């Protein structure tokens, strides 16, 4: 019955049929994005209407369409022809990944460049890289991909070990025209292989690792009902899946006594971007938005037991659309399980003689995705004590280049002649807040140091200050680690027993934000990435910090546009957008496959409860 | 045979006998600190000499002594009478914890103050709080404790729920004189109990938690030999225990092919301090150094299976001295085990078709200690990929006060009339570095942003810079989270295959450092806490950032004195001192017993290896 249930195969087939019948899904059409739309606000009316949003691409060169359909009524709600030079190109298709290599393989400029380097064209792989927006006039309104080459010596060879530097090409994937081929000069192609399964490279595998067994003889402490509704240790939520954002959490709430108390209405990673910091023309254009341009959900991995998720696991197998509207299941694409988390609370008291120890645990909801060379794990955690946390785990193979003779200020060396250009991985968490309901506000909290003097004669005092963010214009905030800056989301109309408004405190990692010059294309296209925290007023159509159509969009889209409305956010339905990321100067240890590195954020209750919420946890 | 073996009961008995025979341990003497001394530098001579350092207190008012003895030769190496007004008082004795309450119970001023508040003296507990150094002339050279009162309604009652504000007393624990009683006025004593085991407060315990079983059917992957030598997944180290610092790690090294490569010679938490930020005279003097003043090792908990350490556990049971020189075992005081740590490395490659997943694990060495109201877990982690990490877990019961009518800028409210003064918990990690040997240097690494212009026409470039710290005078460093500041410890004489010096990168959490005004007593006594990173030249007698005798020391001791020597640290035997801590504005959820909060740091290899060190990890 739940309006937050996962999309079904049947629903996806209905969308296909509705689209087909309406004349919108002929043979030259491709579905570039398809997702179910969340229930609308003020929906306490009881009138379920399952709607899906679709981006439809045309391979024959006709303009694409944005379409919303109702799978309840079988109707097309809206169908709008898009002007891509205006509002952006559609997300990259998986079926386009091979096109760049294929178009270049018969191009004389490209073959010439390969020939100079003595590379058999049959062995040259070409990365299908998003183009962004730079100085090339002919690219406006064209569906462009850029291509960088990597040699693959044999079918099972890791191409990333063999970048072809000094060469890049641009292709119109629709007209099938190679628009430009740029050769700045030959660089040696790194010769060492990067094959991390080769005994030559790995050496003899370890025999020292003894097994670790994690089991639950009574089964899990959480229940799953209605397909995706989770209940666990007072927590309640719905686990959604969208082909763009991946795992999405809905209706995060905590059972406090008799009350079901909302905390976050919707939590997602609404964008991620990987900007490169190498000023070489071969790569200075490169900034892929894995979420917005490539859609990380469609590449979610099937997670295998004992390997990806250890212990007592419950899987969801979300259904997506293929490029033709057929339902495709990602089997075991989402892991759900609880983990022991060490000590929760502990005290041995010298006066009462009481010794007390309780253990902690967390509910984990996760998926792993792959987009070319890079692979990410996305993890949401719910803790017994009311803490909510997200963690991204970055791994895969680093994007490579030549390492210049004489070195580089913007590239690191991984192996002889093999380079790794500097880059960032920057995420945006979109948190549709609902602290005890929708009437919320955000305060910026700073530590306040105090001067020695009257009222502080020993110079020991320190304090804190809170600044309420009242309007969107003043809600674009930056980190200040030195002054312990956090942000509190509170409900001014809902007070705890000490008569203070209930709250949750956001703790950032205070990692560097976007490093690019503010006049850069990427600073404009990824403006969200330039500040740590944004607060907006909720709106149905404000979904992504980068706007709906990120691919080849000229800039200013998303958050910087939304906040221009300068709406009231002081005791209103608001959305917090947190930017957090990793700045990556690759190390030799990252090669030839990268050990996981992590980044994320958490929120902890701040006077949300009237006392510790874990006093009723048993002794074990 | 190892010179790094744990102290034995027999060794401690030898120290007692040697001290007794030398006339240094008569009936009025107490051992305030006893610990074994690490092997000296340049010790490739093969001549074991187990030495112990002892601080000896006298309860009759005679001056204390610092004594070093050899348990090999049975000799007193040195015995020096201390002038405590000059160099500081000795650490607080456990047997002194009860003295403050006992002395005050027959004092007329104290009884008067209690009587005004209608508190039965039999029910009033008094915290034995370190005194620090302020304006009280009579305190120089006196062994003083300050006392704050808490009512305990019955034997098993949590006194912390019932602070007696507006009252503090000072006592000379040797002369048994109450020097001052200060009553600034009556505050209501908070009436609600804080008994977290009471069904009235906890409510019905949860029945929803299903068991989680962690077992190793083949046993652990690490070996323990020689009592405390650990070998695990290429790691090698010795686990020490000192009554002051607690668990200490020695000779951390990594087996890389045929080579045993040193990384850290000695790792410890060499000090921790908890400064309070309430300008009330009742508490404005309060800054306890749990390590330096109280000795956290002597209060290490006996850790029980299934409760404190879950899984396949191997315990050490370290031996310490009691106040009379008798050996006392802390049974199961140290936990050692390996934990699964999720995904280590993962890639599904679109061109090779190879799907690859490896799991991570970490070796954990930990202990838990209790000092009055507060309890801490100290955890060291070694990861498969070469990462070293420390984590402190803070729990117990928060130090309480009245909550002022009309509120407070320096105290938070936990319950009706119950306050929690603002404070910090600040740690100093002392890392005696040995990156591939003792010839080390430290660089400060900052991200460098670049301006759009010639050579960076698209404004996308960013870089990094490194600054070698050459002399101690310039090695006092502060965090800069905004510019991604880290510190690299390298060996300029040991290069990897790409001909770069091998290194390890320190990643700080960039939490606020000491907040007190720089003119404060605590800023002088805890100068280390005012900066994130110090580098010194190794010296035998430079052990603690606060000096040897922290209790009632007037200031300037430790690091600020050491760095005055302005020694060469560029390619030399050096020691890194990292300050990291939590700034605590207590929340209602922290009451009546605090959920664990954490803080720490890590180091990751930075071109230490010639490629990823975990390519030989099996597939599971
Ligand atoms: O991450 C998306 C960019 C990318 C896509 C395919 C191959 C390499 C890189
Ligand atoms: O943490 C050391 C200070 C302290 C000691 C004993 C009781 C309360 C506080
Ligand atoms: Cu990276
Ligand atoms: Cu605290
Ligand atoms: Na445009
Ligand atoms: Na909201
Ligand atoms: Na002095
Ligand atoms: Na050293």
From Swiss-Prot, chains A, B:
> Which SUPFAM superfamilies would you find in this protein's record?
Amine oxidase catalytic domain, Amine oxidase N-terminal region
Q: Which family does it belong to?
A: Belongs to the copper/topaquinone oxidase family.
What does the entry's cofactor note say about binding and number? Binds 1 copper ion per subunit.
Q: Which PANTHER family match?
A: COPPER AMINE OXIDASE, COPPER AMINE OXIDASE 1-RELATED
Tell me what PTMs the record reports for this protein: Topaquinone (TPQ) is generated by copper-dependent autoxidation of a specific tyrosyl residue.
**Upregulating conditions:** By phenethylamine.
**UniProt cross-references to NCBIfam families, sorted A to Z:** PRK11504.1 (NF008559)
Please, which domain of life does this record's source organism belong to?
A: Bacteria
Which Cys pairs does UniProt list as disulfide-bonded? 309-335
Native organism taxonomy: Bacteria, Bacillati, Actinomycetota, Actinomycetes, Micrococcales
Do you know which InterPro entries this protein is assigned to? Answer: AGAO-like_N2, Cu_Am_Ox_Cu-bd, Cu_Am_ox_TPQ-bd, Cu_amine_oxidase, Cu_amine_oxidase_C, Cu_amine_oxidase_C_sf, Cu_amine_oxidase_N-reg
Keyword flag Protein biosynthesis: no
Where along the chain is the active site annotated? 290, 374
Q: Which PROSITE patterns match?
A: COPPER_AMINE_OXID_1, COPPER_AMINE_OXID_2
- Identify the residues that bind Cu cation: 423, 425, 584
Residue list for modification 2',4',5'-topaquinone = 374
What role is this protein assigned?
Catalyzes the oxidative deamination of phenylethylamine to phenylacetaldehyde with the concomitant production of hydrogen peroxide and ammonia.
Question: What are its E.C. numbers?
Answer: 1.4.3.21
A GO MF annotation of the entry reads: quinone binding
Q: Which cofactor does it need?
A: Cu cation; L-topaquinone
Q: Does the keyword ATP-binding apply?
A: no
Protein name from the UniProt record: Phenylethylamine oxidase
Tell me which UniProt keywords the record has, alphabetically.
Copper, Disulfide bond, Metal-binding, Oxidoreductase, TPQ
Q: Cite the record's note on assembly.
A: Homodimer.
């Amino acid at each position: 019955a739940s309006p937050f249930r996962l999309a079904s195969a049947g629903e996806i087939s209905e969308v296909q049929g509705i689209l087909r019948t309406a004349g919108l899904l002929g043979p030259e059409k491709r579905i570039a994005y398809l997702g179910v739309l969340d229930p609308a606000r003020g929906a306490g009316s009881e009138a379920e209407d399952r709607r899906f949003r679709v981006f439809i691409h045309d391979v024959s060169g006709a303009r694409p369409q944005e379409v919303t359909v109702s799978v309840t009524n079988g109707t097309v709600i809206s169908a709008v022809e898009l002007d891509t030079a205006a509002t952006g190109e559609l997300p990259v298709l998986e079926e386009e990944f091979e096109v760049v290599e294929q178009l270049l393989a018969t191009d004389e400029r490209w073959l010439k460049a390969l020939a100079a380097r003595n590379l058999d064209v049959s062995k040259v792989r070409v990365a299908p890289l998003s183009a962004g927006v730079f100085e090339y006039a002919e690219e406006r309104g064209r569906r462009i991909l850029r291509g960088l080459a990597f040699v693959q010596d044999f079918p099972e060879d890791s191409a990333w070990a063999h970048p072809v530097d000094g060469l890049v090409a641009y292709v119109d994937v629709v007209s099938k025209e190679v628009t430009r081929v740029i050769d700045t000069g030959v660089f040696p192609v790194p010769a060492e292989h990067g094959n991390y399964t080769d005994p030559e490279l790995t050496g003899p595998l370890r025999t020292t690792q003894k097994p670790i067994s994690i089991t639950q003889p009574e089964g899990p402490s959480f229940t799953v009902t209605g397909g995706n509704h989770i209940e666990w240790e007072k927590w309640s939520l719905d686990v959604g899946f969208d082909v763009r954002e991946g795992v999405v959490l809905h209706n995060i709430a905590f059972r406090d006594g008799d009350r079901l108390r909302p905390i976050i209405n919707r939590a997602s990673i609404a964008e991620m971007v990987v900007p490169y910091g190498d000023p070489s023309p071969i790569r200075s254009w490169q900034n892929y938005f894995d979420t917005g341009e490539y859609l990380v959900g469609q590449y979610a991995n099937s997670l295998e037991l004992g390997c990806d998720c250890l212990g007592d696991i419950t899987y969801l197998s979300p259904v997506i659309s293929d490029a033709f509207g057929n339902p495709r299941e990602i089997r075991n694409g989402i892991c759900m399980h609880e983990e022991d988390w060490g000590i929760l609370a502990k005290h041995s008291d010298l006066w009462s003689g009481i010794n007390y120890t309780r253990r902690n645990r967390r509910m984990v909801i996760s998926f792993f995705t792959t987009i070319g060379n890079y692979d990410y794990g996305f993890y949401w955690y719910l803790y017994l004590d009311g803490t909510i946390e997200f963690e991204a785990k970055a791994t895969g193979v680093v994007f490579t280049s030549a390492f210049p003779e004489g070195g580089s200020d913007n590239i690191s060396q991984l192996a002889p002649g093999l380079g790794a250009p500097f880059h960032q991985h920057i995420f945006s968490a979109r948190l549709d807040m609902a602290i005890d309901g929708f009437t919320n506000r955000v305060e910026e909290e700073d530590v306040v140091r105090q001067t020695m003097g009257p009222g502080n004669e020993r110079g020991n005092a320190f304090s804190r200050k809170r600044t309420v963010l009242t309007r969107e214009s003043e809600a674009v905030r930056e980190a200040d680690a030195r002054t312990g800056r956090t942000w509190i989301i509170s409900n001014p109309e809902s007070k705890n027993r000490l008569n203070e408004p209930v709250g949750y405190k956001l703790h950032a990692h205070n990692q560097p934000t976007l490093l690019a010059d503010p006049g850069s294309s990427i600073a404009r296209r990824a403006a969200f990435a330039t500040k740590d925290l944004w607060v907006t007023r909720y709106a149905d159509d404000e979904r992504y910090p980068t706007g709906d159509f990120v691919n080849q969009h000229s800039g200013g889209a998303g958050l910087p546009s939304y906040i221009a409305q300068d709406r009231d956010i002081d005791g209103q339905d608001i959305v917090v957008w947190h930017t957090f990321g990793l700045t990556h100067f690759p190390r030799v240890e990252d090669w030839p496959i990268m050990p996981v590195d992590t980044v994320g954020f958490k929120l902890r209750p701040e006077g949300f409860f009237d006392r510790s919420p874990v006093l009723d946890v048993p002794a074990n």
